[PDB]
Every structure is written in C-alpha cells, then in structure tokens.
C-alpha cells in the first residue's frame, strides 16, 4: 500500500527548454541490501502503450536518449528532460516496485508554440449516405494552436445549437498544433430544406472569425 | 525482435466472462515473469496481477483478486487473462506486461492493448462514407479530404490509407458519441489539389468486433 504522488499534473513547454517532475512516494523505496532505489518511470505517448525510460531510479532502459536523467533516492524522485524535443509529448508516469506495483497519477506534457491560425474546409453529406436518409455535414479544422477554438455552425444565417459534436486531436509530433473535426448531422429532409451551409471559427491566430460555406 | 502480441477488440455482455491473450516472442519465456496493466480511458495505470511460466505462480493486486485470474503457457509462451462477473467498471485498455522476477517489476516491453468494451449491446459496423474534397475544401493549392465512419459499436475501428502507404498529414480523430448511442469519426487528410487529378485516395478501415472490412474510394 505505497501512494505514488506526482505534480504537476500537467504542464507546457517550449523546444529547448528543460522540464522536472517529481513523484513523491508515502513510502520509502530504498534497500538496504541493494542500496538500489525500487522506482520505473514510463513514457506513454498519445494511443501508444507505456515505454519504460528509467529503473532502478537512475538507470536509463537501452535507447532512451541521454536527455532523460533519472533522479532521486528513498521517498522523493524527479525525472528531467534538458532539451525537451516536439516529439516528447506525453503522459510520464512514476511507478514503485519495493512492493506491489502501484503508479503514480502521471505528469501530462504539452508542448509551447506560437500562435498558428488554423485551415478551414468544409463537407457535403456523400450520395452514398444521404442514400439512406442521414446526412451528416463536416468542419475539418486543421493545424492550429492553442486548443482553444470556436466553431459555430450556421444554416441559412440561422445559428444551431444541439445538432454538432466536435472531435480534437492530440498535439502534432512535429508541429506540436491540433486538428478539429466539427460534424453537423441532421436528416436529409432537414438537408433539403435549406441553402447555406457554414462554419464560423473563432480562435486566437484569426483576427476576423473565418466562414467556410458551400451551397447544396 | 522482442514482441508482444495481444488478442483484439472484445464485446462481452454484462455478467460473462472474457479471456484476452498474450504471445510473447523474442526472448526465453520462462525467465521473465508476466504482467496485466489496466488502463480505464483518460485514466492512469493500474497493475493487476503477474505471473511466471515456471509453475504459474501468481501474485495479484488486491482489489483485482475477484475479477482477474491468470494463465500461463510456456508451451506456447503465450500468457492469458481472464475477467469474470463483467459490469461496466471493466471496461478499459489491458496491456501485457513483461518484467524480470529476478529484479521487479519494471516492465520493459508492454503489450500493444487490447480494448474491452462490456455492453448489452450487439456489435454493429460503421457505415463508412467518403469525405469530399471541393473547392472550398482548399487554401492555398492544397485540398483536404476523408473518410467518416459513422454509427459502430464499440470501439474501436482502425484507420489507414493506402494501406499503410501514406501517413503525410493523416488526421485520424477520436471517436464521439452521438446522441443515438453508436461512435463516430473521421479521418482526414490534407493533400494538393494537383495530386488529385492523377492520384488514388483509399480509407482502410477495419472495425474488427464486427469484422467488418472496407476500402471506399474518396474521390472529388
């Protein structure tokens, strides 16, 4: 019964910079015997399953690059990263093995870029669908930072509510931005009962709110 | 050359039982004990339980032991898992997990996951449509385009284009839940508005619960 705690739960960071999380644990990790310190830290990058950077608390695992350094002995560790890449995005977790495994709540890393405005499409209901009496709109809002992005639907000047669901992306691995996916559905009788249709976005790298629209 | 192999996607139905495996190939089994990691959506790790090939010994996480059993197979170095009375809290992402008994458990090479998803429901494939690429699908010479794959249960389904030939660009989203209950997503890519003329764009997708399989063409 070890409670493995780390902070931040969270933070953000520029390339270059260098980063430090700790993962303080109720219970000491160190024996006596050993004088080796019983703590893993794992990577876990966005829909990948967890790579082990550290044991033994200071030991980097085979081809983990030399900006992880573990750190740390008895009941207080710190993982730091000097040159943090774009590529370091992530979930790390501290995980403690002097008795049964527990994990700590993870640190999330997110990554600081400048304000990147993002590209806006739009797209019809295919045949193929409103073939079956659905018909499902889409707002496809690529590559912008922060996350932080409005998008409202309007039909025929008449702004909906209710009738949308967005879907964002993790951060990009190279750009470090975000994609966002804004589908409208209603029925093909709703379809056809209209003209325009848009999709206005507001966002931080747009001075003047970005319409995209198409006509049925 | 160390892999480890998991089973796929499982629909099991509130109360049954289900039994996910593990083949791991590319080191000597039985001097590496085995571990199962569950991980809820958004949420963090949590062990479960492991075991070593050498007898099946286990050792289990004590909130686990009621829910998880597991066994083992040298034979086939392949380890299994087995989750009984399923409610909804069992619904999650379980790795394999290998470690060495001889040191702890620091767990040096995972599985690659396993979605469990515990419904009432049956499964259903998704009705993949094509996203179109137009004129106001452009900015600055360059066109986006898609496949939505709209109405499965559960998840998840997996998308690829070109079989795996292409990965420029490619924005894959996480599913959303409508309002009728079944998944959603899209899966775009940004592409020039030359290529299209004289360029092929196919959307893989597999959802496998329902073994479900389509190669929609996505055309302007």
């Known amino acids: 019964d070890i409670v493995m705690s780390q902070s931040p739960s969270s933070l953000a960071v520029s390339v270059g910079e260098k980063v430090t999380m700790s993962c303080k644990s109720s219970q000491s990790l160190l024996y006596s015997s050993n004088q080796k310190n019983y703590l893993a830290w794992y990577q876990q990058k966005p829909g990948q399953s967890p790579k082990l950077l550290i044991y033994?608390?200071?030991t980097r695992e085979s081809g983990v690059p030399d900006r992880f350094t573990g750190s740390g002995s008895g009941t207080d560790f710190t993982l730091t990263i000097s040159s943090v890449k774009a590529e370091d995005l992530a979930v790390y977790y501290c995980?403690?093995?002097?008795?049964?495994?527990?994990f700590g709540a993870g640190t999330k890393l997110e990554l600081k870029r400048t304000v990147a405005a993002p590209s806006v499409f739009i797209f019809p209901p295919s045949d193929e669908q409103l073939k079956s009496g659905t018909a499902s709109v889409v707002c496809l809002l690529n590559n912008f930072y922060p996350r932080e992005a409005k998008v409202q639907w309007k039909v025929d000047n008449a702004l909906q509510s209710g009738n949308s669901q967005e879907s964002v992306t993790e951060q990009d691995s190279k750009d470090s931005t975000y994609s966002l996916s804004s589908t409208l559905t209603l029925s093909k009788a709703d379809y056809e009962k209209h003209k325009v249709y848009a999709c206005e976005v507001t966002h931080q790298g747009l001075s003047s709110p970005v319409t995209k629209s198409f006509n049925r | 050359e160390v892999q480890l192999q998991q089973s796929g996607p499982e629909l099991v139905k509130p109360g049954a039982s289900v039994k996910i495996s593990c083949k791991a190939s590319?080191?000597?089994?039985?001097?590496?004990?085995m571990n199962w990691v569950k991980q809820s959506h958004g949420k963090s790790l949590e062990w479960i339980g492991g075991i070593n090939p050498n007898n099946g010994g286990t050792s289990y996480n004590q909130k686990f032991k009621g829910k998880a059993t597991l066994t083992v197979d040298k034979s086939s170095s392949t380890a299994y898992m087995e989750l009984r009375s399923l409610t909804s809290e069992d619904s999650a992402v379980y790795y394999c997990?290998?470690?060495?008994?001889?040191?702890?458990?620091?767990?040096?090479?995972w599985g690659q996951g396993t979605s469990v998803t515990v419904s009432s429901a049956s499964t259903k494939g998704p009705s993949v449509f094509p996203l179109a690429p137009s004129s106001k699908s452009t900015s600055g010479g360059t066109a986006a385009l898609g496949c939505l794959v709209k109405d499965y249960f559960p998840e998840p389904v997996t998308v690829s284009w070109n079989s795996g030939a292409l990965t420029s660009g490619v924005h894959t989203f996480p599913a959303v839940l409508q309002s009728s209950g079944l998944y959603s997503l899209s899966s775009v890519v940004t592409v020039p508005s030359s290529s299209l003329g004289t360029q092929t764009y196919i959307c893989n997708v597999n959802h496998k619960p329902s073994n479900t399989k389509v190669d929609k063409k996505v055309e302007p």
């Open positions: 997990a290998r470690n060495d008994g001889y040191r702890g458990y620091a767990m040096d090479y």
């Open positions: 995980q403690q093995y002097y008795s049964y495994p527990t």
């Open positions: 590319g080191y000597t089994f039985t001097d590496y004990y």
């Open positions: 033994w608390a200071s």
